[PDB]
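Interim report to the steering committee. The following record documents the input for Lysophospholipase-like protein 1 (222 residues).
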Amino acid sequence: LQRCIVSPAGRHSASLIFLHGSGDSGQGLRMWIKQVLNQDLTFQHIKIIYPTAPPRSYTPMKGGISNVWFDRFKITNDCPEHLESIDVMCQVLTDLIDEEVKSGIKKNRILIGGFSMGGCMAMHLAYRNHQDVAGVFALSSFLNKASAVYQALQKSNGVLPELFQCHGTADELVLHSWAEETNSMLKSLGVTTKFHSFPNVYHELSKTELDILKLWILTKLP
């Protein structure tokens, strides 16, 4: 994968893998956050990796080529996830996590999250393959009904990474009810989570959301 890296200001001791939503790129997400904050998101010790999803067919674009982590049949929670494309991407992003580990960053100092389709991807990578990460965040995201996530967590008995999930209540693309169903599902399967609903926020990033996100990141990667 191609990627945009935002370095820590000093010694690197932890890593944030932050996955972009459908159609975007890692430099796109980076610049979008920079606009929403009026300065870059940056840390003292945490390196931010914004990888770019390789271009591939996307069924809601009638098979047109898009930077997408995985394919979807339909934009809804009431259809099955496309598990074969999700699993191909779990293996690709696993390689990226492993490049970090091999750099000296322990898995419990790696936080994975994303916006929209990138937060979905994050949740499948964390709760199915990498339950020892520091935490998981999902902005404007949901899991499809009957997700392999749910079935993995049903079968798990160990400590799991905490989820920070935010959603705009006025979102017309990814409905708030799909995101709260996902949050409730995960809580009932033993995930500890922080769910934050932003009235008057649609399918977008907001400054307040990103500020709260930053605060919680610092609790998970001191």
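The two ends are 28 Å apart (CA to CA). The committee is asked to note this result when reviewing the revised timeline.
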